[PDB]
Amino acid sequence: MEVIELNKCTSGQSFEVILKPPSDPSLEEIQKKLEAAEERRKYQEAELLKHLAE
Amino acid sequence: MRECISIHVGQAGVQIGNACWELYCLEHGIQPDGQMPSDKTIGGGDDSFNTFFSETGAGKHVPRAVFVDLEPTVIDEVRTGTYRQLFHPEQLITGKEDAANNYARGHYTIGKEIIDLVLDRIRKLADQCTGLQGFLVFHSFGGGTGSGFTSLLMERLSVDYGKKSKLEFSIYPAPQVSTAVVEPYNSILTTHTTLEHSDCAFMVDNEAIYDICRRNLDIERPTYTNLNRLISQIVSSITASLRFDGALNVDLTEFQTNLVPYPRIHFPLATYAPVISAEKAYHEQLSVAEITNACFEPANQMVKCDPRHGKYMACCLLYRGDVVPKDVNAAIATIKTKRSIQFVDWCPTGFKVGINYQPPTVVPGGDLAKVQRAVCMLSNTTAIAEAWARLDHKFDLMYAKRAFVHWYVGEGMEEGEFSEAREDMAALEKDYEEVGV
Amino acid sequence: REIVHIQAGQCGNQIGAKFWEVISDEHGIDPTGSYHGDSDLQLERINVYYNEATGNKYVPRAILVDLEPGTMDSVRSGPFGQIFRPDNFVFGQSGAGNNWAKGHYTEGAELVDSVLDVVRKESESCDCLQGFQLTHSLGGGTGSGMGTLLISKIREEYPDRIMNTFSVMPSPKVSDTVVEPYNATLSVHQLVENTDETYCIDNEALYDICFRTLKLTTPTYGDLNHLVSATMSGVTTCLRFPGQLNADLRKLAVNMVPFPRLHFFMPGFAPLTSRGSQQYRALTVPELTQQMFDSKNMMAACDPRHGRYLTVAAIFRGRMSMKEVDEQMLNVQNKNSSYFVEWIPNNVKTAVCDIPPRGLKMSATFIGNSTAIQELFKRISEQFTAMFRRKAFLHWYTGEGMDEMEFTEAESNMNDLVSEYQQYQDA
Amino acid sequence: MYTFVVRDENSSVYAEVSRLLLATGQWKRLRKDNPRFNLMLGERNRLPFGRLGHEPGLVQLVNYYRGADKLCRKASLVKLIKTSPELSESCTWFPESYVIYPTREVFLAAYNRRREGREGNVWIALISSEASELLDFIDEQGQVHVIQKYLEKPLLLEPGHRKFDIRSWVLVDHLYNIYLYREGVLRTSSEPYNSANFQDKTCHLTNHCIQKNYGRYEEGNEMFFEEFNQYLMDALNTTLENSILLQIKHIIRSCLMCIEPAISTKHLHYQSFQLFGFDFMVDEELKVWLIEVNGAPACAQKLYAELCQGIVDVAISSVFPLATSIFIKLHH
Numbered sequence A: 001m002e003v004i005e006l007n008k009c010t011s012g013q014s015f016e017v018i019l020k021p022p023s024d025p026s027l028e029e030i031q032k033k034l035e036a037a038e039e040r041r042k043y044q045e046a047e048l049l050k051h052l053a054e
Numbered sequence B: 001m002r003e004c005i006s007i008h009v010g011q012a013g014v015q016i017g018n019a020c021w022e023l024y025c026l027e028h029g030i031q032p033d034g035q036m037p038s039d040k041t042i043g044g045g046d047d048s049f050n051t052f053f054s055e056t057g058a059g060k061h062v063p064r065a066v067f068v069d070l071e072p073t074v075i076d077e078v079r080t081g082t083y084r085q086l087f088h089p090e091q092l093i094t095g096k097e098d099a100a101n102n103y104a105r106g107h108y109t110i111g112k113e114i115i116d117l118v119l120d121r122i123r124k125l126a127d128q129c130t131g132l133q134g135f136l137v138f139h140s141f142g143g144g145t146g147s148g149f150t151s152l153l154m155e156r157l158s159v160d161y162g163k164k165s166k167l168e169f170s171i172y173p174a175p176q177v178s179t180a181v182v183e184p185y186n187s188i189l190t191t192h193t194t195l196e197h198s199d200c201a202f203m204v205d206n207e208a209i210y211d212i213c214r215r216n217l218d219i220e221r222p223t224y225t226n227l228n229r230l231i232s233q234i235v236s237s238i239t240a241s242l243r244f245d246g247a248l249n250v251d252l253t254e255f256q257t258n259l260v261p262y263p264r265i266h267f268p269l270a271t272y273a274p275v276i277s278a279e280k281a282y283h284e285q286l287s288v289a290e291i292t293n294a295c296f297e298p299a300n301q302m303v304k305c306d307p308r309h310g311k312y313m314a315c316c317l318l319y320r321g322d323v324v325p326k327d328v329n330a331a332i333a334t335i336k337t338k339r340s341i342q343f344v345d346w347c348p349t350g351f352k353v354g355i356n357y358q359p360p361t362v363v364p365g366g367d368l369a370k371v372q373r374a375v376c377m378l379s380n381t382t383a384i385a386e387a388w389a390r391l392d393h394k395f396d397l398m399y400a401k402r403a404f405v406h407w408y409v410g411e412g413m414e415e416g417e418f419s420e421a422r423e424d425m426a427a428l429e430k431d432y433e434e435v436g437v
Numbered sequence C: 001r002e003i004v005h006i007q008a009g010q011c012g013n014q015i016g017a018k019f020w021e022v023i024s025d026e027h028g029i030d031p032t033g034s035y036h037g038d039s040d041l042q043l044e045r046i047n048v049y050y051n052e053a054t055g056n057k058y059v060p061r062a063i064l065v066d067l068e069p070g071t072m073d074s075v076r077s078g079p080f081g082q083i084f085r086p087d088n089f090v091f092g093q094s095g096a097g098n099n100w101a102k103g104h105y106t107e108g109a110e111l112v113d114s115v116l117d118v119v120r121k122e123s124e125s126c127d128c129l130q131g132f133q134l135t136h137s138l139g140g141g142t143g144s145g146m147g148t149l150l151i152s153k154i155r156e157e158y159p160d161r162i163m164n165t166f167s168v169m170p171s172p173k174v175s176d177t178v179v180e181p182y183n184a185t186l187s188v189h190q191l192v193e194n195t196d197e198t199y200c201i202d203n204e205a206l207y208d209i210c211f212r213t214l215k216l217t218t219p220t221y222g223d224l225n226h227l228v229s230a231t232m233s234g235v236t237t238c239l240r241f242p243g244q245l246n247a248d249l250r251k252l253a254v255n256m257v258p259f260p261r262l263h264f265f266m267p268g269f270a271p272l273t274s275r276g277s278q279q280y281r282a283l284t285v286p287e288l289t290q291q292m293f294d295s296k297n298m299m300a301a302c303d304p305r306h307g308r309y310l311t312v313a314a315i316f317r318g319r320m321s322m323k324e325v326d327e328q329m330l331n332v333q334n335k336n337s338s339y340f341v342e343w344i345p346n347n348v349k350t351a352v353c354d355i356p357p358r359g360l361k362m363s364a365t366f367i368g369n370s371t372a373i374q375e376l377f378k379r380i381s382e383q384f385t386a387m388f389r390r391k392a393f394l395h396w397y398t399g400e401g402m403d404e405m406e407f408t409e410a411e412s413n414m415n416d417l418v419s420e421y422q423q424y425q426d427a
Numbered sequence D: 001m002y003t004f005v006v007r008d009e010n011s012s013v014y015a016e017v018s019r020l021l022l023a024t025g026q027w028k029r030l031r032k033d034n035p036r037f038n039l040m041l042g043e044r045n046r047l048p049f050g051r052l053g054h055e056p057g058l059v060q061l062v063n064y065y066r067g068a069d070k071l072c073r074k075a076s077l078v079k080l081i082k083t084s085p086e087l088s089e090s091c092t093w094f095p096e097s098y099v100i101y102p103t104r105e106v107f108l109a110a111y112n113r114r115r116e117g118r119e120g121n122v123w124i125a126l127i128s129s130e131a132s133e134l135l136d137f138i139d140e141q142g143q144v145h146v147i148q149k150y151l152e153k154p155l156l157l158e159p160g161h162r163k164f165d166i167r168s169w170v171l172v173d174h175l176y177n178i179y180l181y182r183e184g185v186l187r188t189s190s191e192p193y194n195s196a197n198f199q200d201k202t203c204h205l206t207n208h209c210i211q212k213n214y215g216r217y218e219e220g221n222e223m224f225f226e227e228f229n230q231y232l233m234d235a236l237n238t239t240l241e242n243s244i245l246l247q248i249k250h251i252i253r254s255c256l257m258c259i260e261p262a263i264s265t266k267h268l269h270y271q272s273f274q275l276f277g278f279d280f281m282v283d284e285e286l287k288v289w290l291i292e293v294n295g296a297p298a299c300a301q302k303l304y305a306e307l308c309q310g311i312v313d314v315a316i317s318s319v320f321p322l323a324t325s326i327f328i329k330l331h332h
């Protein structure tokens, strides 16, 4: 067990103990996704209103 | 000093943020009105606590925090509560109708209408920062807002803050306290969309927190207040190194370096000891050895799982109270001989230890007893994949019949997002399996 | 989160008025419209069902509809009749004659636009309208035919609001006319398309509960409506009272309805009580639980053991051990797990409200989405076909312009609903 | 009423345990995949331990110890004995063994010191004295297998000059009590042992199936303990208890106490028990050797009734109580 990088301050201390060594989408792509989903909602709602109009 | 902004999304995130900020104030000596007598540098400073608090000319210490919910009920309780003077009104953002427990409604329908407002309010806090580190995001997996809005917010934060770290505190769904039957859907959807945008995520299973409260606090039926005050203790242990002087985990970047050697396997297991009831008339104070040994008892973990049947990639011990390194190493030496602690072959077998001498603080009149020393272990063990296994199985049972799927498709989501999200999870389980056997 | 309430026809208005009596008592509101209550919990969510009038008087967000004035004159005469906004009384004079076609196509078409005007005025005053709840019968003409016409029109004007109904199913045991199976089958077709959640209140079950359990030899509509008002109070508990859940109609629909057409719930209540007879012994939590799951407490004459529960919502009311509630609720699931579909994990959810209903110290209300509800639709389907195979009594309908094809289509849709319920009973 | 599910339809033993449970009238069986069970009689491979102990209001129990395979796979067993200090410092009851992959340096180091000592140099995977002869078998097989010393001078029962192996059934309960069933069985060979012809099939491998001369000396080529004890008394002037069973009990305790920290469910959200089959060899000096451990053993037909009943009494009803013992508790 080797103790490493012992750092002490008034608030406490820290250190490391070793036992054994080793053996994004763009803003526009986002708004395209959000608006494609909104089209699908509006499409589904237009079908409902069309069915209700029949 | 480098600032950190906290973002609380949905009921779970908002209520856990209340608990955390209540605790933070008690730990730093900040009163409910924002005054901090011990702070002798008025109107500003670059002390360690300034990572989480900004300062007004009148000496007010205000959290670098934004609260967001798609419905106003819960943030209204903050707007009228004990700490109502702590937050500026513009950091408390609410809509009028929530996501109805529906990820798609939180991510697409309603979320698209409020994301830009939230980003502007976040931008207002970032402008007050001289060296913003990144964000700590609090949310549930199960809520429609906690799941759906969080993932939309995380995507945008990557766009607007590409260079900033993002940590998560995530509430994993448990039927003992859960509200909705569709939480497995929301959990899988939000994990898939958020995975690449989160650097490090601390999962808290409400089942684990619930049982700790029943067994160790003798609370027959814990409330959210019971669960959240306990959760705030663990969160405080984790963030103490950002708010206090010290050499370990001093910036968000260090959490990833110390706990996450692979990006996707970025879910460290938290274990905390001792949880002692305030009601007990006689209590025998637990030693360094006893609380360190409790870190390897599954009954003390934030997620119930069996680390003996996985492999470690990283392990931190975060002590608070009367602890000296000599006693830690003696305790670690004893524990190594008696416990099944296997590291992956490409990682050193060791503990990174940090000690804060101030013993944990407890909310007056709360359920936690005052203790002389406490510890929170952060370990990145493949054993946590059991929680993913549990969740994906429930997702599979429902999605095989397409049960409830029509509520998501009706909000503009496509059925294929379910299967895309589920195969990402399947990849995540396989990754944990490769690393773990 | 405002709800707009609508009651149509004789049955719709008789149970609708009883509903407003019972919950007005629970919220401490008198016939005056003034609040004379004891607890602030009674007023925290009073806005869900009541508008605030001048001088702090609460006016129900209720719209009273009928094609004849008789039952509505009775409502205005009734105990709480003065609490309703006079403008919300919308009525014709011709009557519907127990004829769905008259309610849906002819007489009701004349009146429906004036009802929609009052609905609009009530909606426009809402901070955030949740949706609508309708009280009606399916076996008459106005509540059945005009009620479903109203539902179709309300969905056209408010496509993104929730539509909830309390629908009374006809029974030959409590029967006004022989064409009730026609009216009901025509209505069920509309409900399957245009509501999100429908409480199936079966007059057959109400009769049997009054006869067999309550020991009432000759039950009246007043005795049946005592069971209805108690069930309506219970199932709206989590809408009217603050709790851990903060429930609303959409969250209820999302969690109770795995498939959009299978949204017909079996309600249940415990303890079963007859009118004006007080039970002095309270029920233990084990007893509340056992009865509320008992087929004898179901308001839809179906055998729950003949199907499987897709989802269940249970509300316990009174001062009791929530730990005991948790244990008992988990006990029935773990001891009868075969009757809960395995492919919806954790599909039984429980809520507790401290305030009990009037006259009880402990109550339990049950909301079941069970595939056994198909038994109710098969019953109506058989009565329908027994007359339709001979085109009997059809002239009452073809005289209002309907074609036999519309009956053939309605029969087919309901049989499809039946077979759809059967699909998940075997899965 | 207690609930249980069965996910290993091949289990002769737990087929009988399902019948016993149902017959009590206080156990109801559910479908394999219903999660609201008290007891899981689980599948042999990829049993989903991670999904156990998360059903609110259900004490859950399973008939397998997660991690017990480390003792029940020939390769893992060897590694466990070599690397565990609880065992290997001498470990005088396990045959020399080495793990070999087909795609060794330590193996030949001993094999050649036996060539130097002119000592017995027969080994097993399968039996032969020529390493190169069996290694050519190792690589043409393609999977991992061990190479351990073959016990050249066994104890042979007369009349027959036969060889045998001893199978002991041990149940470990949720509390980690170690229960050795008092009935063992000798799996006997009818073929007289031959020191010269190892490639000869049936005389050296005492497996029940492998003996398709079957049944000559005693029924089923199974000699139970009462007879074997009588033999040792008449023949060798000793008892089964003193000459063999003391060593067997020591070996069972040593193996299970070793892995106890890795597999115990004492503070776990679910519980485990497991029935094990220990297979032993006895040399001519009345010394007992552990051959292997079987994690899903089958019983002898004569004993199915008494043992499956004991599984219920000690391992199932201890946890789920209903409305002179057949085991010897091995203490630790």
Ligand SMILES: Nc1nc2c(ncn2[C@@H]2O[C@H](COP(=O)(O)OP(=O)(O)OP(=O)(O)O)[C@@H](O)[C@H]2O)c(=O)[nH]1
Residues within 6 Å of the ligand: B009, B010, B011, B012, B013, B015, B016, B069, B070, B098, B099, B100, B101, B102, B106, B140, B141, B142, B143, B144, B145, B146, B147, B171, B172, B173, B174, B177, B178, B179, B180, B183, B206, B224, B227, B228, B231
């Ligand atoms: N630990 C803890 N869990 C909570 C809390 N509040 C809610 N939860 C859990 O979070 C899940 C429900 O998500 P919520 O946060 O309430 O939902 P939401 O984000 O507000 O989204 P909506 O569906 O729009 O209401 C369930 O699993 C709850 O048990 C809390 O205060 N503490």
Ligand SMILES: Nc1ncnc2c1ncn2[C@@H]1O[C@H](COP(=O)(O)OP(=O)(O)CP(=O)(O)O)[C@@H](O)[C@H]1O
Residues within 6 Å of the ligand: D095, D124, D148, D149, D150, D151, D152, D164, D165, D204, D205, D206, D207, D279, D281, D291, D292, D293, D294
């Ligand atoms: N080192 C060894 N020395 C002498 N004989 C051995 C031996 N290893 C095995 N044998 C003999 O070979 C037979 C089978 O070997 P082994 O026990 O390794 O596999 P197995 O067929 O028994 C699978 P299981 O034990 O699960 O039923 C044993 O019964 C034994 O007679």
Ligand SMILES: Nc1nc2c(ncn2[C@@H]2O[C@H](COP(=O)(O)OP(=O)(O)O)[C@@H](O)[C@H]2O)c(=O)[nH]1
Residues within 6 Å of the ligand: C008, C009, C010, C011, C012, C014, C015, C096, C097, C098, C099, C137, C138, C139, C140, C141, C142, C143, C144, C168, C169, C170, C171, C174, C175, C176, C180, C203, C206, C221, C222, C224, C225, C228
């Ligand atoms: N439970 C109950 N059922 C009723 C009541 N009044 C009528 N019904 C039933 O409703 C059907 C007749 O419908 P009704 O409402 O009277 O016709 P409408 O006025 O045209 O809507 C029959 O099945 C009756 O049994 C009532 O007060 N309570």
Ligand SMILES: COc1ccc2c(c1)CCCN2c1nc(Cl)nc2cccnc12
Residues within 6 Å of the ligand: B179, B180, B181, C235, C236, C238, C239, C245, C247, C248, C249, C251, C252, C255, C256, C311, C312, C313, C314, C315, C347, C348, C349, C350, C351
């Ligand atoms: C099957 O799973 C469910 C079922 C119902 C509900 C939920 C989940 C989540 C919240 C909404 N909800 C409820 N809603 C309303 Cl009004 N009354 C309830 C009464 C009891 C239980 N539940 C609700």
Ligand SMILES: [Ca+2]
Residues within 6 Å of the ligand: B039, B040, B041, B042, B043, B044, B045, B046, B055
């Ligand atoms: Ca300062």
Ligand SMILES: [Mg+2]
Residues within 6 Å of the ligand: B010, B011, B071, B098, B143, B145
């Ligand atoms: Mg919410």
Ligand SMILES: [Mg+2]
Residues within 6 Å of the ligand: C010, C011, C140, C176
């Ligand atoms: Mg009538």
Ligand SMILES: [Mg+2]
Residues within 6 Å of the ligand: D292, D293, D294
């Ligand atoms: Mg074997």
